[PDB]
């Protein structure tokens, strides 16, 4: 369960309308919900069980983990197979023992539109930007930690 206290290994936290998740840095892929590692291009005996993509590891083939399915060459949760969210992403409902839509910042699920990301709504940023000279900033429909109004880039300065 990715929370505001989660430290993304080789990644950084981003926030949407209904959840938080780890975004991998550079060309790394998710091996779990909070750890990013480099992906192998081929699957053989030396690279068996090695990560070949997000929630997928290396008759050799790249297969999604349990609960995930290959949809458009991407592993998504099984309950999100037939879910389209538009201005957002399908996630598993942590409050339901079901695929629901988490929307880009600025949009919220519209109860008048089958909870699709078609309603204008604000989302309070919950990120704890630990690094100095940084704060929570909004960009491309998500919240992430970035330099303040007087800093940029190794470390913000």
């Amino acid at each position: 369960k990715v929370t505001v206290d989660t430290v993304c290994k080789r990644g950084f936290l981003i926030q949407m309308s209904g959840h938080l998740e780890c975004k991998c840095e550079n060309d790394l892929v998710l091996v779990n919900e909070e750890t990013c590692e480099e992906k192998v291009l081929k699957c053989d005996e030396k690279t068996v069980n090695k990560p070949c993509g997000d929630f997928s590891k290396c008759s050799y083939a790249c297969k999604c983990n349990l609960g995930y399915d290959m949809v458009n060459n991407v592993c998504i949760p099984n309950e999100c197979k037939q879910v389209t969210c538009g201005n957002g992403k399908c996630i598993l409902d942590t409050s339901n023992p079901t695929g629901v839509c988490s929307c880009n910042i600025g949009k919220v699920p519209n109860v008048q539109d089958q909870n699709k990301c078609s309603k204008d709504g604000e989302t309070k940023c919950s990120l704890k930007c630990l690094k100095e000279q940084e704060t929570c900033k909004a960009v491309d429909g998500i919240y992430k930690c970035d330099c303040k109004d007087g800093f940029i880039i190794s470390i913000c300065t």
Partner: antibody
Framework: QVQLVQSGAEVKKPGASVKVSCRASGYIFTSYGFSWVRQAPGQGLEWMGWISAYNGNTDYSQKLQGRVTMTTDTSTNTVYMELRTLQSDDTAVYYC??????????????????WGQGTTVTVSS | DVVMTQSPLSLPVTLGQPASISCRSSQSLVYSDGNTYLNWFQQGPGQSPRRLIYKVSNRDSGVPDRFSGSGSGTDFTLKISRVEAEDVGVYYCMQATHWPLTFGGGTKVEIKR
């Protein structure tokens, strides 16, 4: 409503410069970026460049790198475009388009989703 | 730069009949995250382009059901199940997988007679 309103048509002499505005409305201006696309008469679309209203990252097309200048105004929601050394083949319709804020990472937003009305620029003596 | 090639240049269609436009890329459009990023735009006569399809097969808001996108890698197809009168115009495909963005040459839809 994420609407984009562009400025009126402009007529310039060869060798002069032109400034084109594009006022954004309906969303958080500083959370996204812009790309400018022109279209010669009877021809297709041509990508001119991209500028970030989030981090100020500008980027021009290599074929037209030496005569394009892009700026953004955070006070008044507007993205400007300055084209220098207006040649005769620069006569085209210039469009405004909302693009991504950071060119390095990709999230769940996909740019070029909203386009302005377009502005006509004619270069002639 | 990625070269986008559409076919045909002009597509005569009959009202109520299906239609399809081809778009081919010079390189694979599969991005580093596994997505493809192939957008389809519609430009009416004297109007601004509007994006009908985003990412692979996803339709933007307000796009009718008759429009549909498909394909993978370097070959893609925009299909119209039942062409209507307002569908005339020029259709462009654009890639965002590789920087910089590049558009297709365009495909002019006309009425066949």
């Amino acid at each position: 409503q994420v609407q984009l309103v562009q400025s009126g048509a402009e007529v310039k002499k060869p060798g002069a410069s032109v400034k084109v505005s594009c006022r954004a409305s309906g969303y958080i201006f500083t959370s996204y970026g812009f790309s400018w696309v022109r279209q010669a008469p009877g021809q297709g679309l041509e990508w001119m460049g991209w500028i970030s209203a989030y981090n100020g990252n500008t980027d021009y097309s290599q074929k037209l790198q030496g005569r394009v200048t892009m700026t953004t105004d955070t006070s008044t929601n507007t993205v400007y475009m300055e084209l220098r050394t207006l040649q005769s083949d620069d006569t085209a319709v210039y469009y405004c388009a909302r693009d991504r804020g950071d060119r390095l990472y990709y999230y769940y937003y996909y740019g070029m989703d909203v386009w302005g009305q377009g502005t006509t620029v004619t270069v002639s003596s | 730069d990625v070269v986008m090639t559409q076919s045909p240049l002009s597509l005569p269609v009959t009202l109520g009949q299906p239609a399809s436009i081809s778009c081919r890329s010079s390189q694979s459009l599969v991005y580093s995250d596994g997505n493809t990023y192939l957008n389809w735009f519609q430009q009416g006569p004297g109007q601004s382009p509007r994006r009908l399809i985003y990412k692979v097969s996803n339709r933007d808001s307000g796009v009718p059901d008759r429009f549909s996108g498909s394909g993978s890698g370097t070959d893609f197809t925009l299909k119209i199940s039942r062409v209507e009168a307002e569908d005339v115009g020029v259709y462009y495909c654009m890639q965002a997988t590789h920087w910089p963005l590049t558009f297709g040459g365009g495909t002019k839809v006309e009425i066949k007679r």
